[PDB]
Amino acid sequence: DVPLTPSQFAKAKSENFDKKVILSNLNKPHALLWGPDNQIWLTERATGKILRVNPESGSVKTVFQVPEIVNDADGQNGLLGFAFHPDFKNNPYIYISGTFKNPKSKELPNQTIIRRYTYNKSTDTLEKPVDLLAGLPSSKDHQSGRLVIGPDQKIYYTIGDQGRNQLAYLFLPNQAQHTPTQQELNGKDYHTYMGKVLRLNLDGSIPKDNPSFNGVVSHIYTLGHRNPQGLAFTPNGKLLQSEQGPNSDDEINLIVKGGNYGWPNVAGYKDDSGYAYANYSAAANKSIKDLAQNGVKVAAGVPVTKESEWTGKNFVPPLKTLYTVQDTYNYNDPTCGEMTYICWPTVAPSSAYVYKGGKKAITGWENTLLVPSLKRGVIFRIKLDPTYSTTYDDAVPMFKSNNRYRDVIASPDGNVLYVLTDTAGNVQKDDGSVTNTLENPGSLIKFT
Amino acid sequence: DVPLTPSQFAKAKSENFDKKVILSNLNKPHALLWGPDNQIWLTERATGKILRVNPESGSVKTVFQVPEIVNDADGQNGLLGFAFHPDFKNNPYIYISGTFKNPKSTDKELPNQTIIRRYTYNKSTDTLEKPVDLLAGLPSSKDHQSGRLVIGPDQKIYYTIGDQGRNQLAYLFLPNQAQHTPTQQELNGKDYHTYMGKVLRLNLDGSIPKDNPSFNGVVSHIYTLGHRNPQGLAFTPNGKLLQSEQGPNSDDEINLIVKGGNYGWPNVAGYKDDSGYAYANYSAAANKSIKDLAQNGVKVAAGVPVTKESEWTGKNFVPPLKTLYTVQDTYNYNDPTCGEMTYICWPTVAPSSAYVYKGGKKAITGWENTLLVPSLKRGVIFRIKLDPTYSTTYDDAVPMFKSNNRYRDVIASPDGNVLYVLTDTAGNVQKDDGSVTNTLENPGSLIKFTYK
Ligand SMILES: O=C(O)c1cc(C(=O)O)c2c(n1)C(=O)C(=O)c1cc(C(=O)O)[nH]c1-2
Ligand SMILES: [Ca+2]
Ligand SMILES: [Ca+2]
Ligand SMILES: [Ca+2]
Ligand SMILES: [Ca+2]
Ligand SMILES: [Ca+2]
Ligand SMILES: [Ca+2]
């Protein structure tokens, strides 16, 4: 899709909704869920706290604090994945993922672990931790970490590309396209588990019906992803996803078994438009600079591959891009002054939520996907047809404010939306400029 | 997708198949089907002839000639739709569509109508009889007729009817109706002027399915709207509906047809990307002396209103699964390598059909879940892979069978190791070197390709 302008974003104020702050003292609130007890459960990424909030009254309790979570102030690591077992009353388990030190490792001292806890209703806390899958890659960037349980009773988990080929990890070779050998797998070497959607058995083992990649069945379900922070099943069992792109081409994807989503060789569609793959790990010197022009303009010494020059297999294009631009696009927009990036043709989607409606369903919102935006301070509404096979029309912005929206859910009746906002960071103002003064830092807000 | 180069097309020779020309110099052969009798049945658009050909011998019989078909030598009209009833053994019916004179026409420039008609096949006398009109009074013109007719798993007729060529060439100043739908009044009067640029869904007797989608509070024969020239339409084994469609100077499409979807034409070509196309509405131009610069709306002469794809306010827009091809605004539509015939260098392939490859006991290795899309201007047949659920394409459109021919239609035998193809009798095609030729290697042919 074509980028909206600052003026278009500015007008998306959603005055048909009443706003109320439920909680405002949260630290890096990250995921929120409508729990089996009709309470809202949410996570704090850096503290590792799991909170439970009464949706009506706003009363809150800290149910548990995951010990030894590691978080960098300048990082995206910490407590990430969070889901309930679908038959909680009979299987009182909570599944998480988190950043923990890797005793087996200075560069990348940590690992990601997918862990199960048992909920004890009488004492109201979590106990009997079980590591389901450990030794997963960890870094400060592009961790993704959405964890959901599908209709098939398997765990689906997004694990980002770890930031390879950008900023602090510029010279590390991106592994989004790589898959494990049977040896690696046999040795629990999950280095290639970067830029993937994993599909695991509830005990962390490999599903016998997982797809085969380069001749091996591993935990990998799909590959070729950058930073997919949104993952959500539809009522008819399809799997929708949102994913952050570089300077362009954030994506809404339909996840299909064995698909290759193209990163880093392809951003968005395979169109050779506004992006090219500049592989710094293959560069001459590690002194070469990244001009940060999305591969369209690069310094000498770095090999560039056009999207159309890639020789990949099973490439699956996005349902929608937010956004795609042409090669004439100027990635250095003066409007954003110092924080040049905020003006890039992206929205920085932080999650993806399938709106299920209910007795008070919002008129016209049938079959919509809600996608919060960090940098634009809006929640997008994206309509799909009734079979969730295609998007209809464009991504419609809502709730414009000077806030970084991190996650969103709706009440069972469907007339109230609950959102999390970041504690700190940059956001685009109504006038297109940048501010780090957030209106509702680290909050749980409801829109009725 | 990004356009292939002349060198990439030239390499796609398909050395893994044996080629045998069964017939040549047919008169505008258009559609072909694997017959209920295991013979090849094919139509001649110009003559209205329905031919049956034997595979070993190439023996041909004119089974029937649809009377009074109207065809212009310089047009795309004539005998179009062609399908058998799915349970032919118990329902020996053949369904066609064709161009016929419209006695009720109030306009000399558009004297004809399209009629969807059923015939009964008589095995005893080996002919067609008892004609029954199912739907008459449909739009007709010399351009963008489309006319693919298939019967779905739901036992309904699905029919593509093109935008009639409005907003280009000889019909430049006529207002395109692809986005328009009938009022209840027009429907009551059987005024089907808005049945342009649509996929229609009809009951087997021609009536309106009560479960058709509603457009502006009216349920008509329209199933989807916003199409230009969709010549390909085919159901998948899991009941999904795939389609190929010709775009203007860019953005030919492979679409997934969903009930009530709006495919965007003419406001949007391919993706809604403002890239390489804009909607220049000549019917709204200041006067009829204005020229079409033929730069796909990116550059236009003064006096014609232009709307960007992103400025359109239509609803239920469905983007293509794949574009052949998409380019940027800087693209040069006046490519000198095609000389006095600039258009065959445009970033399109001119898809003429769409066929779902079903395999069989001798299925071709790697061709599972593929869609075969013949190209008129490039002289190739594309193979497009989809996942096993036919939810997305995988990779790109792979060219095959490169030759100086205009490929019109393609099917496979039940065993799946043989392809049968039709080629045009005349027209332009791109040569291996990228230049244009009107010397076709196999004019008006039925060609067999057998996997080695
Ligand atoms: O293109 C951008 O403008 C931009 C902005 C941001 C952001 O504002 O946080 C992120 C990203 N990109 C980036 O692609 C990304 O993966 C990312 C992760 C996060 C986060 O806070 O978790 N923000 C961002
Ligand atoms: Ca980005
Ligand atoms: Ca992708
Ligand atoms: Ca791209
Ligand atoms: Ca064309
Ligand atoms: Ca279209
Ligand atoms: Ca377009």
Kindly report the nearest CA distance between residue A327 and chain B, in angstroms.
Answer: 8
Contact (CB, 8 A) for B152 and B211: no
CB contact under 8 A, B2 and A307: yes
Check residue A206 and report its DSSP letter. Answer: P
**Residues lining ligand 1, CB < 6 A?**
A 76, 142, 227, 244, 247, 341-342, 344, 346, 348, 374-375
Q: What is the CATH number of domain A1-448?
A: 2.120.10.30
* Nearest Cα residue in chain B from A4: B310
Asked if B116 and B160 count as a contact pair (C-beta separation under 8 A), the reply is no
Give the 3-state secondary structure of residue A358. Answer: coil
Resolution in A: 1.5
If we measure between CA atoms, which residue out of A399, A346, A395 comes closest to residue A375? Answer: A346
Taking CB atoms and an 8 Å limit, are A259 and B387 in contact across chains? yes
Sheet containing B322-324: give its strands across: B229-235, B241-246, B252-256, B322-324
Helix, strand, or coil (residue B146): strand
**Can you read off the two tokens belonging to residue B353?**
């059909």
User: Quick one: which H or E segment has residue A114?
Assistant: strand A110-120
Determine how many CB atoms are found less than 10 A away from the CB of residue B284: 13
Nearest to B153, CA basis, from B244, B230, B94, B238: B238
- Interatomic CA distance for residues A230 and A66, integer angstroms: 23
How many Å apart are CA B377 and CA B136, to the nearest integer?
A: 32
Name residue A138's amino acid.
Answer: S
Q: B66-84 as b/e, with b when 16 or more CB fall inside 10 Å?
A: beebbbeeebbbbbbbbbb
Q: Starting at the earlier edge strand, list the strands of the sheet with A40-44.
A: A29-34, A40-44, A49-53, A60-65
CB-based burial of residue B351 (10 Å sphere; 0-12 exposed, 13-18 middle, 19+ buried)? buried
Beta bridge partners of residue A79, listed in sequence order? A98
Q: Cα torsion for B414, B416, B417, B419, to the nearest 10°?
A: 80
Q: Which two tokens stand for residue A108?
A: 């990348």
- Contact between A224 and A261 (Cβ < 8 Å): yes
Angstrom distance (rounded) from CA B55 to CA B52: 10
Q: Coil, strand, or helix at residue B348? A: coil
Give the other-Cβ count within 10 Å of B170's Cβ.
13
**CA quadruple A288, A291, A295, A296: dihedral, nearest 10:** -130
d(CA B198, CA B135): 15
Instruction: Quote the ligand 6 centre to B381 CA distance (angstroms).
Output: 21
Half-sphere exposure of B104 (CA within 13 A, CB side): 11
Residue B52 CA to residue B42 CA, distance in Å, equals: 6
DSSP B16: T
Interacting residues of A245 by C-beta distance below 8 A, sequence separation 6+: A226, A251, A267, A268, A275, A321, A346
CA dist B449 and B442 (Å) reads: 14
Contacts of B394 in chain A (CB under 8 A): 259, 313-316
Which tokens sit at B383? 């193979």
The answer to whether A209 faces chain B, any CB pair under 8 Å, is no
B1-452 is a CATH 3.90.320.10 domain: no
